[PDB]
Swiss-Prot record:
Protein name stated in the entry: Toll-like receptor 2
Entry similarity comment: Belongs to the Toll-like receptor family.
Post-translational modification: Deubiquitinated by USP2.
Disulfide bonds: 4-10
Subcellular location: Membrane; Cytoplasmic vesicle, Phagosome membrane; Membrane raft
Protein's organism: Homo sapiens (Human)
Domain notes: Ester-bound lipid substrates are bound through a crevice formed between the LRR 11 and LRR 12.
Subunit structure, as described in the record: Interacts with LY96, TLR1 and TLR6 (via extracellular domain). TLR2 seems to exist in heterodimers with either TLR1 or TLR6 before stimulation by the ligand. The heterodimers form bigger oligomers in response to their corresponding ligands as well as further heterotypic associations with other receptors such as CD14 and/or CD36. Binds MYD88 (via TIR domain). Interacts with TICAM1. Interacts with CNPY3. Interacts with ATG16L1. Interacts with PPP1R11. Interacts with TICAM2. Interacts with TIRAP.
Start and stop residues of the LRR repeats: 28-51, 52-75, 76-99, 100-124, 125-149, 150-173, 174-197, 198-218, 219-246
Tissue: Highly expressed in peripheral blood leukocytes, in particular in monocytes, in bone marrow, lymph node and in spleen. Also detected in lung and in fetal liver. Levels are low in other tissues.
Superkingdom of origin: Eukaryota
Induction data: (Microbial infection) In macrophages, induced by SARS-CoV-2 infection.
Length: 321
């Protein structure tokens, strides 16, 4: 069914709706129909909701949205179409939504964002999430056109195969950029386009085997999550990090790290904080000597407490002769 409170906040509580409820009026201020069985949105469904501020359609089976389905939604600020079955995106959907501050299109099976810029006029957008884990393979220069200031941009480009240079270059500022990408071949391509516009960069799922590194970066924090790394690739990645003059925070937690090359952190003189926890550190002595000693010398940098595999003792508590 669909229950609305006195304030116009409506929710599709039970998962049984086969389509958007009929008869919605100008009184509806929020519509959350997540986890239902909607598969199609027609032009008339939301035609009277001129005061709708949030539309959440997460996890439905939507595969078709008629061209002008959102025409009357000029008051819309939050739109979530995440995890549906949209194989292609239409710029006409976003044309009437200039007030948007949050847009989530994550989890839909589209290969690219389309042949037409989708966000050219979303001048108030703060959070944008696009991509998917298995089908998204290309990023084009026309994507993101129009976007100048963003608080958070999340791109799941797990299967990214192509990246048109300067695609991300047009955005003047992005506070937090999260990039999911399995391969590293396009990493430096993307890096040069965002080094001067991103404050916090987060790289997820990347296989860094065989990665090699050979300006005025403004990145202040770099986070790695679920990346595949080794002493050799960590050294190459550090060559890149060593070049970021103002790098203040480095998050290396959750990357299945077992060790680090001796002296790996010696050139990060401007670093203020480092995260090394949630990693199965091999605290056998010869191997862990550098890291244990480094944590004690730079006693104020570690955030959280890195622990040893097996014993679970703090890495900094290990002393090798
Ligand atoms: C998406 O649009 C492209 C270009 O028209 C088309 O080739 C593709 O089949 C569409 N995806 C599907 C199957 O919905």
């Amino acid at each position: 069914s669909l229950s609305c409170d006195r304030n116009g906040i409506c929710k599709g509580s039970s998962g049984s709706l086969n389509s958007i409820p009929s008869g919605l009026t100008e009184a509806v201020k929020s519509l959350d129909l997540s986890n239902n069985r909607i598969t199609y949105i027609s032009n008339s469904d939301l035609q009277r909701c001129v005061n709708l501020q949030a539309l959440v359609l997460t996890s439905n089976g939507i595969n078709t949205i008629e061209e002008d389905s959102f025409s009357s939604l000029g008051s819309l600020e939050h739109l979530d179409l995440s995890y549906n079955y949209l194989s292609n995106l239409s710029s006409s959907w976003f044309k009437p939504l200039s007030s948007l501050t949050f847009l989530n299109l994550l989890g839909n099976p589209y290969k690219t964002l389309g042949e037409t810029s989708l966000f050219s006029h979303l001048t108030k957008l703060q959070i944008l999430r696009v991509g998917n884990m298995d089908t998204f393979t290309k990023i084009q220069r026309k994507d993101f056109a129009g976007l100048t200031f963003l608080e958070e941009l999340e791109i799941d480009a797990s299967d990214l195969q192509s990246y048109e240079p300067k695609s991300l270059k047009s955005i003047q500022n992005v506070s937090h950029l999260i990039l999911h990408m399995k391969q590293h071949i396009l990493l430096l391509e993307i890096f040069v386009d965002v080094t001067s516009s991103v404050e916090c960069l987060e790289l997820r799922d990347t296989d860094l085997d065989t990665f090699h590194f050979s300006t005025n970066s403004l990145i202040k924090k770099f986070t790695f999550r679920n990346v595949k790394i080794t002493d050799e690739s960590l050294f190459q990645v550090m060559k890149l990090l060593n070049q970021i003059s103002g790098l203040l925070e480095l998050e290396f937690s959750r990357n299945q790290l077992k060790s680090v090359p001796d002296g790996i952190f010696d050139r990060l003189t401007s670093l203020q904080k480092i995260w090394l926890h949630t990693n199965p550190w091999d605290c056998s002595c010869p191997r862990i000597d550098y890291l244990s000693r480094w944590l004690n010398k730079n006693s104020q940098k570690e955030q959280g407490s890195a622990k040893c595999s097996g014993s679970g003792k703090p890495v900094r508590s290990i002393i090798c002769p």
